[PDB]
């Protein structure tokens, strides 16, 4: 399903910076949406480890 | 700004489970949106560490 969330401008920029980096690393299809989805899942995994 | 992304049903459920847990831990205002935003920032931090 869709998730709609809100971040500060600095965090937003850091995610868009990662889109550029991901493309440079050969992920031609990288987008704000699919980078965000990957980061959200990574954060979920780490937060569950730290519980 | 707003971020709109998409996750599988299992990941979505795990995030909603964390909303329930966060409320149980005293975060009365926890929501899918604000849990997601916190996880997205955590994932960003970990991914940048692992670069």
Curated annotation (Swiss-Prot), chains A, B:
Keyword Transcription regulation annotated: yes
Localization terms from the record: Cytoplasm
First-listed, main subcellular location of the protein, grouped into a coarse class: cytoplasm
Keywords: Conjugation, Cytoplasm, DNA-binding, Plasmid, Transcription, Transcription regulation
Gene Ontology, cellular component aspect: cytoplasm
Any one GO molecular function term: DNA binding
Record flagged with keyword Phosphoprotein: no
Function text: Conjugative DNA transfer (CDT) is the unidirectional transfer of ssDNA plasmid from a donor to a recipient cell. It is the central mechanism by which antibiotic resistance and virulence factors are propagated in bacterial populations. Part of the relaxosome, which facilitates a site- and strand-specific cut in the origin of transfer by TraI, at the nic site. TraM binds to three principal regions in the oriT (transfer origin) region; 2 are required for autoregulation while the other is required for plasmid transfer. Plasmid specificity is conferred by the TraD-TraM pair.
Quaternary assembly: Homotetramer. 2 homotetramers cooperatively bind to DNA although they do not contact each other; cooperativity is achieved by DNA kinking and unwinding. Part of the relaxosome, a complex composed of plasmid encoded TraI, TraM, TraY and host-encoded IHF which binds to the F plasmid origin of transfer (oriT) in a site- and sequence-specific manner. Interacts with TraD. Probably also interacts with TraY.
Family the UniProt entry places it in: Belongs to the relaxosome TraM family.
Protein name: Relaxosome protein TraM
């Amino acid at each position: 399903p869709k998730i709609q969330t809100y971040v500060n401008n600095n965090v937003y920029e850091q995610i868009t910076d990662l889109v550029t980096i991901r493309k440079q690393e050969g992920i031609e299809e990288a987008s704000l949406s699919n980078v965000s989805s990957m980061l959200l899942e990574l954060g979920l995994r780490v937060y569950m480890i730290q519980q």
